[PDB]
Structure 1
Amino acid sequence: SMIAAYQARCQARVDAALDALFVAPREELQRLYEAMRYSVMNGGKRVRPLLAYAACEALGGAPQRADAAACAVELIHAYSLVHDDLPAMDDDDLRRGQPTTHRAFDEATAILAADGLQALAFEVLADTRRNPQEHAVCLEMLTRLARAAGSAGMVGGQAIDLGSVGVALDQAALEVMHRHKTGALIEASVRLGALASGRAEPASLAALERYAEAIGLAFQVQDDILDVPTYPALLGLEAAKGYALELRDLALAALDGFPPSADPLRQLARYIV
């Protein structure tokens, strides 16, 4: 309701900012930049931008302060999908009915476009015009994003996944995989938005990290539920649904004491499940 509207405003805000980043600086680079644009400007829901803006507003910052944060998280996400789609990875020909990047262009150009998206994510955070935070804050945002995106985070999770093929994951191992593959970047989206607020403090960051850890897992449990090694297969459908509610409750509990400006985060938590 309110969250639907909030989503739409965040999607518009981040899309305007992202669109500006795909201008080839010379003609020989036009096709590469087209493939970059194709890979990002695909009507995606922008959950990670929404989290960055909402965490920013939760601490009292104007949302436009998180524009670079929101761009950077989405760029990381977008690049990861491009590589994931490749034949040697998940080998997907379509994404929401449209050719994947390697299919529209070619494999090499997809590989490269995504590589350039990752560089661009760090570029936008280190750019003190695009990301006009205090310099110590910019470095912390970069640090968190690099950790979350790299082999100890998102890329790590993809390797754990590929290493678990033909192995029956217990719940603990499944959750390790998820924490890395998607949790890290979800947690970073919240962290970076909070940092962009100019009002972050250790207690509020810790609370928001608790929120993000819960919401991150809830997204996946609910995704598996909606699809019906998944949560419903492990737990049974009913127990999976109950778990999703438990994760919502944890998220809400983590926002104890936050002002009304945290309502978008509360609404999202409820909405997921």
Structure 2
Amino acid sequence: SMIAAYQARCQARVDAALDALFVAPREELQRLYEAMRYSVMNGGKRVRPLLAYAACEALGGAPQRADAAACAVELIHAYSLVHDDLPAMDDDDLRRGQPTTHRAFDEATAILAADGLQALAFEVLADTRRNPQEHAVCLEMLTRLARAAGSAGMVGGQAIDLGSVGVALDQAALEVMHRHKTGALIEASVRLGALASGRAEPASLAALERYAEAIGLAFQVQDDILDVPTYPALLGLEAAKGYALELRDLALAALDGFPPSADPLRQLARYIV
């Protein structure tokens, strides 16, 4: 509704900023840059940039302050999907009905494009012209994204995912995996946007992290539900729907006491489920 409009603005905005990053500095690197562009500019919904923009606004910041954050999270997200698709992992020919990067190009070029996307994510955050926050904040943003994207976060999640094959997984184990594999980067999108506001404080950061923890799981539960070891398989379908709504509630609760500028986050929570 309003969240639909909010999403569309966030998407337009981050796409414009992203599209500008893919000019090869010289002719020999053209194909690499085209693969980088192919990997990012794929019509994705940009939830992570929406979360950075919305967390910035929830704390009273003008959203353009989060522009760099919004690019950096989507850069990390994009590189992850390129690697996930590779023959050594999920070996997928298609993502959302289009050829994956390694299929469109080749496997080496895909690995390289995504490796470049990761470096570019950090480069954008450290660039004080693109990310004009106080220097201490730029460094906290970098620290946070590096931890979230690395072996103790997202990459670790993917390892947990690949080490759980054939192993019988219970709910607690499935959630550990989700918290790493997708939770860490969702929490970082929120944290980074909040930092970009220039008004972050420990209490408001802690609340927004509770919000992010809840919605990050809600996305996964709801995906499983729409697809019908999954949440519906563990709990049954009706109980899985119940858990989704419980997560929405914990998200709305974490936003207790926030101003009206936090409505986009409240709406997103409701929307997911």
TM bucket by the smaller chain?
over 0.9
Give the drift of 1:93: 0.1
Q: What is the DSSP-based 3-state SS (H/G/I as helix, E as strand, rest coil) of the residue aligned with 1:198?
A: coil
Give the drift of 1:233: 0.3
CA displacement 1:169-228 (0-9 Å, x = unmatched) = 111010000000000000000000000000000000000000000000000000000011
For residues 260 and 110 of structure 1, what CA distance do their matches in structure 2 show? 43
* Aligned residue in 2 for 1:168: 168
* Aligned residue in 2 for 1:255: 255
For residues 84 and 261 of structure 1, what CA distance do their matches in structure 2 show? 36
Q: What is the DSSP-based 3-state SS (H/G/I as helix, E as strand, rest coil) of the residue aligned with 1:146?
A: helix
Give the drift of 1:168: 1.4
Tell me how many residue pairs correspond in the alignment.
273
* Aligned residue in 1 for 2:80: 80
For residues 178 and 170 of structure 1, what CA distance do their matches in structure 2 show? 12
CA displacement 1:113-138 (0-9 Å, x = unmatched) = 00000000000000000000000000
Q: What is the DSSP-based 3-state SS (H/G/I as helix, E as strand, rest coil) of the residue aligned with 2:165?
A: coil
For residues 17 and 67 of structure 2, what CA distance do their matches in structure 1 show? 7
Q: What is the DSSP-based 3-state SS (H/G/I as helix, E as strand, rest coil) of the residue aligned with 1:123?
A: helix
CA displacement 1:52-83 (0-9 Å, x = unmatched) = 00000000001000000000000000000000
Q: What is the DSSP-based 3-state SS (H/G/I as helix, E as strand, rest coil) of the residue aligned with 1:132?
A: coil
* Aligned residue in 2 for 1:268: 268
Give the drift of 1:167: 1.1
Q: Which runs of 5+ in 1 are unaligned?
A: none
Give the drift of 1:97: 1.2
Give the drift of 1:8: 0.1
For residues 62 and 20 of structure 1, what CA distance do their matches in structure 2 show? 22
Give the drift of 1:264: 0.3
TM-score, normalisation: structure 1:
1.00
CA displacement 1:17-48 (0-9 Å, x = unmatched) = 00010000000000000000000000000000
For residues 39 and 52 of structure 1, what CA distance do their matches in structure 2 show? 21
* Aligned residue in 2 for 1:11: 11
For residues 96 and 221 of structure 2, what CA distance do their matches in structure 1 show? 21
For residues 20 and 254 of structure 1, what CA distance do their matches in structure 2 show? 36
For residues 95 and 182 of structure 2, what CA distance do their matches in structure 1 show? 18
TM-score, normalisation: structure 2:
1.00
* Aligned residue in 1 for 2:125: 125
Give the drift of 1:96: 1.3
* Aligned-residue RMSD, C-alpha: 0.3
Q: What is the DSSP-based 3-state SS (H/G/I as helix, E as strand, rest coil) of the residue aligned with 1:90?
A: coil
CA displacement 1:67-113 (0-9 Å, x = unmatched) = 00000000000000000000011000001111100000000000000
For residues 230 and 49 of structure 1, what CA distance do their matches in structure 2 show? 27
Identity %: 100
* 1:41 aligned onto 2:20: no
Q: What is the DSSP-based 3-state SS (H/G/I as helix, E as strand, rest coil) of the residue aligned with 1:256?
A: coil
For residues 96 and 161 of structure 1, what CA distance do their matches in structure 2 show? 21
